[PDB]
Design a protein around this ligand. Structure first.
Ligand SMILES: *Cc1cc2c(nc3c(=O)[nH]c(=O)nc-3n2C[C@H](O)[C@H](O)[C@H](O)COP(=O)(O)OP(=O)(O)OC[C@H]2O[C@@H](n3cnc4c(N)ncnc43)[C@H](O)[C@@H]2O)c(*)c1C
Ligand SMILES: *[C@@H]1O[C@H](CO)[C@@H](O)[C@H](O)[C@H]1NC(C)=O
Ligand SMILES: *[C@@H]1O[C@H](CO)[C@@H](O)[C@H](O)[C@H]1NC(C)=O
Ligand SMILES: [Zn+2]
Ligand SMILES: [Zn+2]
Ligand SMILES: [Zn+2]
Ligand SMILES: [Zn+2]
Length: 479
């Protein structure tokens, strides 16, 4: 029943499922993935249809609270909760239907996750989509912020395949969006992050699951000087040579730097591409993984222990602080400073660990870069690099130190080594790899850069009262 919760009373009246705060359902869906930023929602609705979403939004309006859609709950700032206490949460993971038609167009409900989605696309016509590695990630949050992975260099962002959607607006209206209908909102949904509308169903174009994919890894044994020379070589290569069908990211930690990625082709061809750059990068490295497989195979290569088929039964958690950055080609100062930081300022206590991913995001032959900053809300098409910084506390159940008090300075300083060298307008961050220490003003500029003003105008049109806003989302500001 709706004891002590007027919103639950409204939801019950609308025949919309909800979680009582004293329930196990609340324990699961009301507890953020990142326990460092767990929040307490005002209520939790569990819509099962587009109409249910609209009814729930109306209930939130009646209550005078902000409303946050939660897809897979993998946002680093817990934006499925609104990024703070007190929002009406719409847990969408019960809405995960995936259907591929005879035109190879896939309809995917707003609460579907990557793993389940990938499986369904394969089962339904051997189709594929360009998306991240984590099977638990919600398609919703993923596409709204971009959707980056080992298929991005070859097939762009997840949002580059979106052709339409059925969404619920802040006034509880239900509309369809596409490049030809409510095109401004469609543009905003493709990269604008959260707060524009609540998506009930996404419509995606798809590509045929590749017949062959070669996954690889290069393990280096580089000292400080070699790190710098290697990164400089990889940068020139990334910008002028790296082939369309190859993806790469560098996995970096206190004692290693490994290259890894997928190649939409065979192993023999891949080795002919890697050999030259391995030599140019200064040697001192070797291929540590090189195997041909298929789409299903590559997906299962980057699960890292996570279950592949996840729907509404999800209760995984971590305790960490993350950050990100996007940037153009770097000068020697940025590279040298980054390397110096790894060697001289990355010592952490036992129980704490960190890693960084240096993503080959843009470049001449990157499909992502084949789209201009004006074509979708994604605003980093001009950036060659994307980075993810991850600061984990493994024994968080026993000790979270230095968090929650401090610790942020470690990765903030790591980001600064590179960011400080960039012109103000080129400084960016990737919303899908959120930095919780940012203010709403700072976040908007870093996450959406040159597209922020347009996004704010679109936000003003579709959600003037900021009903769907979170603590760092685009604000309603008309031009
Ligand atoms: C935990 C985790 C995150 C990952 C992982 N791997 C990634 C990868 O390989 N590539 C990436 O580009 N990103 C990866 N991420 C980062 C992010 O967690 C994701 O990219 C997504 O942002 C997460 O989506 P989701 O799980 O849906 O996040 P929520 O916290 O539920 O919401 C995020 C956000 O956007 C809104 N939103 C979600 N769903 C909807 C719908 N249907 N309609 C409207 N708005 C929606 C929220 O309101 C909020 O603002 C790997 C791992 C393990
Ligand atoms: C994934 O789990 C769902 C449960 O909702 C099930 O319906 C589906 O068949 C599973 N897919 C598999 C095992 O490929
Ligand atoms: C990084 O470590 C060096 C030690 O050589 C030190 O001089 C510098 O101040 C440190 N920078 C910080 C605190 O981020
Ligand atoms: Zn009760
Ligand atoms: Zn509470
Ligand atoms: Zn080629
Ligand atoms: Zn400088």
């Amino acid at each position: 029943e709706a004891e002590f919760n007027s919103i639950n009373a409204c939801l019950a009246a609308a025949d919309v499922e909800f979680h009582e705060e004293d329930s196990e359902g609340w324990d699961m869906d009301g507890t953020a993935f990142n326990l460092r930023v767990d929040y307490d929602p005002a209520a939790i609705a569990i819509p099962r249809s587009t109409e249910d979403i609209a009814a729930a939004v109306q209930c939130g309006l009646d209550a005078g609270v902000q409303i946050s859609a939660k897809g897979g709950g993998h946002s680093y700032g817990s934006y499925g909760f609104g990024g703070e206490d007190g929002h009406l949460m719409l847990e969408l993971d019960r809405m995960y239907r995936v259907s591929v038609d005879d035109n190879n167009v896939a309809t995917i409900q707003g609460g579907a996750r990557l793993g389940y989605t990938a499986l369904e696309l394969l089962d339904q016509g051997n189709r594929a989509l360009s998306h991240g590695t984590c099977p638990a990630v919600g398609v919703g949050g993923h596409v709204l912020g971009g959707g980056y992975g080992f298929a991005t260099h070859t097939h762009g962002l997840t949002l580059d395949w979106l052709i339409g959607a059925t969404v619920v607006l802040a006034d509880a209206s239900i509309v369809h969006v596409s490049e030809t209908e409510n095109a401004d909102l469609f543009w905003a949904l493709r990269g604008g992050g959260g707060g524009f509308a609540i998506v009930s169903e996404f419509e995606f174009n798809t590509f045929e699951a590749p017949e062959i994919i070669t996954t690889y890894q290069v393990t280096t044994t580089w000292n400080r000087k070699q790190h710098v020379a290697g990164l400089k070589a990889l940068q020139d290569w990334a910008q002028n040579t790296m082939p369309r069908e190859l993806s790469m990211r560098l996995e970096i930690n206190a004692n290693a730097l490994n290259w890894e990625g997928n190649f939409f082709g065979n192993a023999k061809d891949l080795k002919k591409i890697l050999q030259p750059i391995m030599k140019k990068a200064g040697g001192k490295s070797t291929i540590s993984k090189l195997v041909e497989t298929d789409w299903y195979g590559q997906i299962n290569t980057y699960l890292y222990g996570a279950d592949l088929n996840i729907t509404y039964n999800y209760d995984v958690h971590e305790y960490f602080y993350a950050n990100s950055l996007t940037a153009p080609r770097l000068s020697d100062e940025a590279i040298q400073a980054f390397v110096d930081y790894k060697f001289d300022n990355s010592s952490v206590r036992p129980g704490r660990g960190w890693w960084i991913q240096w993503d080959f995001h843009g470049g001449k032959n990157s499909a992502l870069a084949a789209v201009s900053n004006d074509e979708t809300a994604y605003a980093h098409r001009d950036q060659l690099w994307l980075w993810q910084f991850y600061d984990s506390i493994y024994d968080y159940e026993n000790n979270t130190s230095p968090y929650p008090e401090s610790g942020f300075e470690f990765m903030q300083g790591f980001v600064a080594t590179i960011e400080d060298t960039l012109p103000e307008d080129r400084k960016g961050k990737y919303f899908n790899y959120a930095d919780t220490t940012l203010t709403k003003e700072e976040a908007q500029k870093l996450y959406w850069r040159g597209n922020l003003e347009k996004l704010q105008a679109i936000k003003a049109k579709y959600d003037p009262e900021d009903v769907f806003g979170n603590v760092v989302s685009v604000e309603p500001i008309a031009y």
